[PDB]
């Protein structure tokens, strides 16, 4: 009777057009926040926030209002989209294709006029995503809400804290705060300034994840090309084990460029400890090259240097701890045996050269060892973040 | 005649806005519950369930009743969308897109004013997924179900046990069951609790999938990476072998970082697993270039310690059950003769050196052997699923 | 003139919500069937069937006739979607993401009242895809339709036979038929049944490309490894042979896991045959280690067992066709001449293991060639339409 | 003034349900054309083309006429959907989810009373992609517009050539035309013909991209596999170098097979000269084996048979321009000079099986050579296109 | 008060079909314009531009006008979509889905009647992307509106610079500018000139991520297949060191073919310098199996050419500074020690070859690196913008 009774005098001559204000000079004040309900998809590569929102729209129509006295029981009144007038908030930095995600719900007005609007909605939204320091990154995406087509002398918006009561933590990224800023802003359309409100989503990542699947998986990849320096030569699979190794990190890039995006604003922190790897096993590589010339140098070629002869075999060798008929049979002899001790003297130039290929090797491994080590934790220590990550991720 | 008379008569006065409860203090009792037909797809990098999905919402609305006895032969009337009120009933924890995925159907009334309300859908919906204990990993998914603008004041939100006499089994998921509880909860936007009604989907994953297509293959691959354990050193080919192995096992933690979110929750199963098999392949490979040390050792360099000698050539050999012209000429055959028994000492200190090497190769191979086994038992058997896992999907 | 006045007429009184019986007690006969034009997608890994359909819905419109002597030239009238009642058929197992893919068109009625309604549309539907005999598999599609909210009191679904005569082949999937069936199920929301008409799209996979790009392609890869066994040990690349196309076919189950639903119902034949390939060829590199300790065997080493003796050189090998001053020099020169006796007989015993390594890996040739036949044969001649594939797609 | 009254009085009793013609007897001619804007994408795998389209439908409206000299300056009035009755065409092998894809604008009307409608839209359509002939492939895809609901009787559709005047040139298929065809068919569901318009867009692939792209880096990479027959079977990397060529090859189909889609209708140009490289170079490495069994023939083993000492040493060889006391002391220098003479004897048996070796090398390059030529060659200008194609794209 | 009378004035007789003039004879003159707010993602592979935009059009409303001081406080009011007219602007050249991608937004209207309609939206629109020079590549994609159905006797479309002071820059493209032009055209539909509005995105790559990404990464790991020229031919890893460098620049090719479109109206710059790469690392391979020739020649075999001998040993080595009884005995040890001469003189021919083959890598790496350098420079700095990019990015 009297549900029935209210809505058929609370629609009469309404026009939803009309901003419910009594007074048209005076502007209309709307409240405005959200609430958090979870982060659903950080995407790095398109710099697209995705996130599970519920709007918190309030304000006053002066003509919805009715004494509950004369409508017993019924202290509240629902319209749905398009037979009340409400707000016409806006994400401006949407991503989304059909522009505004909001889903609409049910305006709930009480009898002293109060309204209630409370969307809720998957919002995208695009967010200047820096990747400098990536895994160990932090993110602030804005998220800047405002009337399309009401400005300030209209419509007097005003924020109220986002409610995180109801979120959800999301598993790659710590909420830090939703902190909010009320604005007012000129545009070059319109002599009226527009106020909006924007939220400003601060996220650290979690850096377990990427820590276990690319941080450390290069790292102990990485050191295995440091045993070619171990491998004797004679092996034969120095080389084998050097290229092998480093074309195999490429993976750990390939990894990383489906990521990040291909932006030149800065050079991602993960990417500059995947390139210095890379640099310092491919630079094996090439010393590896120097002591298989070293191993198989031409005994009748080029004596040693006096430079090589010292620097290597005697300071750094030091340093590493290393260290008738009976007259023609004579001649024949003679030749055979004299034929081998020009091989035993061409054996021991070979060795010699053999022993610097060694000792090359033991300064590699023990330089490569330490600047591996330097480079890598120099590149992620400068991270602000990293004490904190390491302390809170593992 | 009767269906049009009835019809006609019903819409007379009638106003879809209102709740149609015929005293208006009181609440409308709304049984909600659903028909679980599928399970479509649990995305887990993404965090959401696809399900085929029945709601049913009944109630019983004041209005639309009628004496059969004067409409004969009318006895169910419908209404499509936007007619007839009905329960605004949202998936609160929709991943969905456009938020409300249900297809709106008609409403089935009968006489006495019962309402039958049975819209199909696909419905998304966020689930955090645990990827503790994949692929051997139970699933619990909320479809949270409320009604979005009336509180436990005006609607009386009741729940009925889910139907799944109709539902398909999925291939991949065991359905273990849908219970469903009824909450009543504040929120901080009212003063009125809104009730909602939950279910939670509890699946647990058939392994034999990734039974035979991700462990399986690892062991086996892994496996032979111990052959360079029996591989002799003189076929040149150890490090070819083992690094070989080593870097086409990345492919397994490729494809699990393709299904895996890139969460810091935990650490999957199958991660510490696949883990584990890397480090031990990579050690493999580590003691492999110390057997190729030995191998090739230099005759002329630092004699074999002691302890090398005795732990490797006696204790664990044992237990591995191993084990005037012509004084001329006469001074130049004793060179070449001599020349011949140096080298035929140096010969046995190599050939020690060889038998090192080998001692070594039984040694790890027994030793990665039995590490290999017990790590990878260790770590699938620490899943509590898995005993029932093994019994019920091999 | 006429089309004007019929169209006004027709619509007077009008209710789309009726059911157009002249009798509300009887049901309305709605005759249901479809036009299959092309099977467009058959989705193995969603397990999701995408057809382009024609649905056919046939009824009688007791209030959508007139007398053509009174309208001349009127024989027909259009009406669009929501000002004409038609029956609420929907895909029960439709797999879109909005439920209903149909795209709404006029109903054609004439004078009669007949009714032809033919909505075209691109229908998703879910179908257990049974992957068991992949590539040489059949399926068995269901496309279940009925009236949504009309049970079989109000509405007597009745089918007619589906309409091939437009169908355009696909070129992956042969046709075989689209029977189809009416049931009369009982559910558990209503006490009335509601009557389905179901289609079954049987479709014979067609092999030709998948034997060019997975089976035949597998088979020549694998048979690559067999060359190991006639690859002479001392080439020094028996083990790079092996391994390198063992690793090579893991790209051809990572193209099946890319097709496959992650299932426990079946085991694929596809994956029975490439997991039998790659242990064949894993067993040929363990094959292989041994036949290099064979060959790099340590002559000083323990001897050749009596059993090795015989069932390699001797039973194995036949049936394979294989088979003052001058004292002092003479015993200097004795030395060097007996050292080149034990020399070559410590090389004649060299020879003989070397031998064996030859003969084993002659008989492994024999073996692994005969056993890669059988178990090609065997498991693809295991699938029941395997005859019917050769014949109709080679 | 008078646009306000034109329009008034042109809806006065206007239905859109009618289909304006003054005679209902008589069928409504319209007028059918499209403008082809461009290609944008032509997916071989799910055998779809997608257009940019302007429709073009014009018809005249018998009620939508006025006289200009009493509504001056009013020359045209605009109607947009559901205000004005229109044609229902559509595209009958559309590939779009929702079907009709169509962007409805303002139908423009004249005093006369013609109609222009031309709605833009982006179409998805069914093409039977023939790849037999890819990468010099020409396609024919249909473009099917009709009438849904209106058949010949009551609508007389017409064709007029399609406009090209605005197309923008693709980049990957060079458009040949776009002819119409009008056709009158009969369907199973209806005893009325339904006229329909159907345009064919003619496309030719350019082929330089897939020239440079694949098969010119399959010709270059494949060649590098023909140097293993120029390489020393001494440098121990013959088979390294073939077999991992081979299996480098493999990218390339997985490239194709990437585009193409999954039919057995034919068996693309491109996979058969992919297919016969990899035969090639997969016969290269089994002819690679067997040029190392001759390199290493042990000598002691099977004499070289009289057709190999001719067959390769004579013939193939010639073609390719290759061609007390001291008796003690005597008999154990006999023994130390004959052993000597034994190995000299053994060195030149080798000898003649390593230059075996050479020469089968020599034969396979030229007959590799001339092979791979020649099958390229032939399987290439198989297409009737090719001539064409590499006059107009290179 | 006001607002509501207001509102309820201005909507009496309005017809949203009617060209909002006074005069019907004068065209109405709409200013259009569009604000940048950023550029979201340019596809090149399927020639998309993804813009975010807020459209701006101005025109006076002849019937929407009031008196100030009637309506006190009431300055302004909006309608939204379907109850006020607007001009039906498009973006022609749109590759979006729906077409047209603008959200609706409200019309604002102030007494003057001057009307703004400021819509935002998400663009898609079809831009050829020039690749010729990517990655140091200058897009000009544009983005043309005008009125679809109105031309310019109705509608006299004039231009305002596009606004850029909101504008997000991207990260991935400098924006140069968006000059805008405005064209009058003629169409073979219609005997009216349609008027639009186009401006003109022009962008500016930034080429540091590729630069990082792709282009240093194949200059450096090329590089590493010149050491193949200083590894020594006994290391027997020059064919496994080339061969596997090259396979693996692939990549590279590989990632541009998926940012690449499939045209053959250029061949990108990138792809220009990638082929040279490649072929200067195949031509590479294919030298160093010459060398493995030389090397391993068999001293036996042909004698070295004259020319050889004088090209390579002298003057090319010299430019690169490199340089009874008794009688029975006798003959017994003649014979052995001849053996060793004809061995030594065996051995120097193999030297000579040997040292002709290290010459070789010689000439091969200084000619082989100088060639390498001229390459790259010359493709990269005969790209236009490079100095300009090297200077900005870098
Ligand atoms: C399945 C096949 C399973 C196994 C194949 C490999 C093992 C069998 C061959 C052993 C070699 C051998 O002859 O002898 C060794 C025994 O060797 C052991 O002790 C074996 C230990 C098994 C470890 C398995 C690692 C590889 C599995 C990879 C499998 C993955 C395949 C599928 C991949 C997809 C050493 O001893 P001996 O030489 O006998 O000693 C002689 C002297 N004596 C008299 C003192 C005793
Ligand atoms: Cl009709 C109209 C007037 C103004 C506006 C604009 C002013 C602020 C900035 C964008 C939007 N909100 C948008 N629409
Ligand atoms: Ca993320
Ligand atoms: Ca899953
Ligand atoms: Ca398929
Ligand atoms: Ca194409
Ligand atoms: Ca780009």
Same mark, same amino acid.
């Given at each position: 009777?009297?549900?029935?009774?209210?809505?058929?005098?609370?629609? $009469?001559?309404?026009?939803?057009?009309?901003?419910?204000?009594?007074?048209?000079?005076?502007?209309?004040?709307?409240?405005?926040?959200?609430?958090?309900?979870?982060?659903?998809?950080? #995407?790095?590569?398109?710099?697209?926030?995705?996130?599970?929102?519920?709007?918190?729209?309030?304000?006053?129509?002066?003509?919805?209002?009715?004494?509950?006295?004369?409508?017993?029981?019924? $202290?509240?009144?629902?319209? /749905?989209?398009?037979?009340?007038?409400?707000?016409?908030?806006?994400?401006?930095?949407?991503?989304?294709?059909?522009?505004?995600?909001?889903?609409?719900?049910?305006?709930?007005?009480?009898?002293?006029?109060?309204?209630?609007?409370?969307?809720?909605?998957?919002?995208?939204?695009?967010?200047?995503?820096?990747?400098?320091?990536?895994?160990?990154?932090?993110?602030?995406?804005?998220?800047?809400?405002?009337?399309?087509?009401?400005?300030?002398?209209?419509?007097?918006?005003?924020?109220?804290?986002?409610?995180?009561?109801?979120?959800?933590?999301?598993? !790659?990224?710590?909420?830090?705060?939703?902190?909010?800023?009320?604005?007012?802003?000129?545009? !070059?359309?319109?002599?009226?300034?527009?106020?909006?409100?924007?939220?400003?989503?601060?996220?650290?990542?979690?850096?377990?994840?990427?820590?276990?699947?690319?941080?450390? /998986?290069?790292?102990?990849?990485?050191?295995?090309?440091?045993?070619?320096?171990?491998?004797?030569?004679?092996?034969?699979?120095?080389?084998?084990?050097?290229?092998?190794?480093?074309?195999?990190?490429?993976?750990?890039?390939?990894?990383?460029?489906? @990521?990040?995006?291909?932006?030149? #604003?800065?050079?991602?922190? @993960?990417?500059?400890?995947?390139?210095?790897?890379?640099?310092?096993?491919?630079?094996?590589?090439?010393?590896?090259?120097?002591?298989?010339?070293?191993?198989?140098?031409?005994?009748?070629?080029?004596?040693?240097?006096?430079?090589?002869?010292?620097?290597?075999?005697?300071?750094?060798?030091?340093?590493?701890?290393?260290?008738?008929?009976?007259?023609? @049979?004579? !001649?024949?002899?003679?030749? @055979?045996?004299?034929?081998?001790?020009?091989?035993?003297?061409?054996?021991?130039?070979?060795?010699?050269?053999?022993?610097?290929?060694?000792?090359?090797?033991?300064?590699?491994?023990?330089?490569?060892?330490?600047?591996?080590?330097?480079?890598?934790?120099?590149?992620?220590?400068?991270?602000?973040?990293?004490?904190?990550?390491?302390?809170?991720?593992?």
């Amino acid at each position: 009777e009297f549900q029935r009774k209210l809505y058929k005098e609370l629609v $009469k001559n309404y026009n939803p057009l009309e901003r419910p204000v009594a007074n048209d000079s005076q502007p209309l004040t709307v409240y405005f926040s959200l609430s958090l309900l979870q982060i659903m998809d950080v #995407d790095e590569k398109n710099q697209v926030l995705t996130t599970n929102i519920w709007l918190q729209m309030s304000w006053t129509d002066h003509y919805l209002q009715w004494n509950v006295s004369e409508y017993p029981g019924v $202290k509240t009144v629902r319209f /749905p989209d398009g037979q009340i007038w409400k707000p016409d908030i806006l994400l401006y930095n949407s991503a989304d294709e059909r522009f505004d995600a909001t889903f609409h719900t049910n305006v709930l007005v009480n009898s002293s006029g109060h309204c209630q609007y409370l969307p809720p909605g998957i919002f995208k939204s695009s967010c200047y995503i820096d990747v400098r320091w990536f895994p160990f990154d932090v993110q602030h995406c804005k998220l800047k809400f405002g009337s399309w087509s009401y400005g300030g002398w209209s419509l007097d918006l005003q924020m109220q804290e986002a409610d995180i009561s109801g979120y959800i933590p999301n598993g !790659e990224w710590d909420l830090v705060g939703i902190p909010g800023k009320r604005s007012e802003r000129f545009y !070059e359309c319109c002599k009226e300034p527009y106020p909006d409100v924007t939220f400003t989503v601060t996220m650290r990542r979690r850096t377990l994840y990427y820590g276990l699947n690319l941080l450390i /998986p290069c790292v102990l990849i990485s050191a295995l090309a440091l045993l070619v320096f171990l491998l004797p030569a004679d092996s034969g699979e120095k080389i084998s084990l050097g290229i092998t190794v480093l074309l195999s990190l490429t993976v750990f890039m390939l990894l990383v460029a489906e @990521i990040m995006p291909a932006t030149s #604003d800065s050079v991602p922190l @993960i990417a500059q400890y995947f390139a210095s790897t890379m640099i310092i096993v491919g630079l094996s590589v090439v010393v590896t090259v120097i002591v298989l010339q070293y191993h198989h140098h031409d005994p009748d070629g080029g004596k040693m240097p006096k430079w090589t002869r010292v620097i290597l075999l005697n300071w750094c060798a030091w340093f590493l701890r290393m260290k008738p008929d009976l007259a023609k @049979i004579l !001649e024949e002899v003679r030749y @055979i045996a004299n034929r081998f001790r020009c091989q035993d003297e061409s054996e021991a130039v070979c060795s010699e050269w053999k022993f610097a290929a060694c000792v090359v090797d033991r300064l590699c491994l023990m330089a490569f060892s330490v600047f591996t080590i330097i480079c890598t934790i120099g590149i992620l220590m400068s991270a602000p973040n990293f004490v904190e990550a390491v302390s809170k991720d593992f």
